[PDB]
């Protein structure tokens, strides 16, 4: 940096956190278009090998 020659010496998308532009582009397209269960315990699973 001492040897070097320097010559003669004299957006909002992140702000909100959402892609507000992309969100309003999808809405414009839409506007144009229109205008639990039980699970058995594995150990208790029943087998018929002995009956066969």
């Amino acid at each position: 940096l001492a040897v070097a020659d320097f010559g003669p010496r004299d957006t909002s998308s992140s702000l909100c956190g959402i892609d507000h532009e992309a969100l309003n582009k999808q809405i414009m397209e839409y506007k144009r278009r229109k205008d639990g269960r039980k699970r058995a315990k594995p150990r208790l699973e029943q087998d018929s090998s002995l009956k066969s």
Binding site: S14, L15, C16, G17, I18, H20, L23, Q26, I27, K31
Partner: protein, 326 residues
């Protein structure tokens, strides 16, 4: 009736005096604008609003004072161009009063669609048809996907149940169009057990509907209040005189942060609610702020008097941040 929020503080704060020109970027009902034209009879004032109904009020109220009040219509971003047409590019405005939020008239009139309690078209748009192509809240909910709509609620509504409240909206829209305020409120309630409708509480500790965070979220994405607030403050600074007192009013945290991080230079991409412990950890990693352009008249955010809160609960969260340009 709605008394202007913190009118006594905002008047003292700006100390309107003869020979001073002031701007108002949110005329709305005009209660604050009129309280400012009462203390100083020789004051010069400029008004602005996004609602043509609000701009008509100012025009009708211009009869009371022919030139002391000048009415203008447009958004914060469009304000500089509108005022640039007048030719006051330097502006030398002694004070810019940037009141924020939804007008009392806007949300008291059910037709405007801002009130979930009443039944009106799901507009929720401060614009009064000045741009008839501007999407309304009904359009936002019927078009965006769960991931997209959930982000609107999460980022702008501070809503924990963004995926749960967004899925209900996606299912409801398919069955029928979402076009009315109560129709949406019921859909959001249907995402939770029936008792959830009033489980949540406000900071006032009074029960609120379980969709009060989806009406605020859409209100801010339809009207892009947050992004328009950053440009609005920036434009005020350019048009604000040196030594001129700015006064903002933030009713919710997201807008309050921007005003705080703008009057103090803090980067808008920093982490929120940073503790002293986290601040030390952040900078320890790098080890391996620019000069302020403001002088905060009152260092800490003011708030409405507790007695006044009960009289006007709508304004309970009004955080006043005053500053002088440097």
């Amino acid at each position: 009736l709605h008394i202007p929020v913190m009118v006594d503080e905002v008047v003292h704060c700006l100390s309107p005096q003869k020979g001073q020109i002031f701007l108002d970027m949110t005329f709305g009902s005009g209660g604050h604008t009129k309280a400012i034209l009462q203390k100083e009879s020789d004051i010069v004032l400029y008004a602005l609003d996004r609602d043509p109904t609000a701009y008509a009020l100012a025009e009708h109220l211009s009869e009371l004072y022919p030139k002391q009040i000048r009415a203008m219509l447009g958004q914060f971003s469009q304000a500089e161009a509108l005022l640039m047409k007048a030719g006051v590019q330097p502006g030398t405005f002694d004070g810019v009063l940037m009141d924020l939020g939804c007008s009392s008239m806007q949300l008291d009139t059910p037709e405007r669609g801002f009130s979930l309690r009443k039944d009106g078209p799901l507009d929720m748009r401060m614009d009064g048809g000045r741009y008839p192509d501007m999407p309304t809240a009904a359009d936002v909910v019927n078009a965006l996907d769960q991931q997209a709509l959930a982000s609107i609620l999460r980022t702008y509504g501070e809503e924990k149940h963004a995926k749960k409240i967004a899925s209900a909206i996606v299912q409801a829209r398919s069955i029928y169009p979402i076009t009315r305020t109560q129709q949406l409120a019921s859909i959001v309630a249907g995402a939770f057990p029936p008792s959830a409708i009033y489980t949540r509480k406000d900071l006032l500790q009074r029960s609120t509907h379980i969709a009060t965070k989806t009406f605020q979220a859409l209100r801010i994405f339809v009207n892009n209040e947050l992004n328009e607030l950053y440009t609005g403050l920036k434009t005020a600074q350019k048009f604000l005189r040196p030594g001129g007192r700015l006064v903002a009013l933030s009713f919710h945290s997201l807008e309050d942060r921007i005003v705080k991080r703008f009057l103090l230079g803090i980067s808008m991409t920093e982490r929120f609610n940073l503790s002293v412990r986290q601040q030390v950890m952040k900078t320890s990693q790098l080890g391996s702020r620019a000069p302020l352009m403001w002088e905060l008249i009152h260092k800490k955010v003011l708030s409405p008097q507790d007695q006044d809160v009960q009289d006007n609960p709508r304004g309970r969260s009004a955080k006043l941040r005053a500053a002088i340009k440097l």
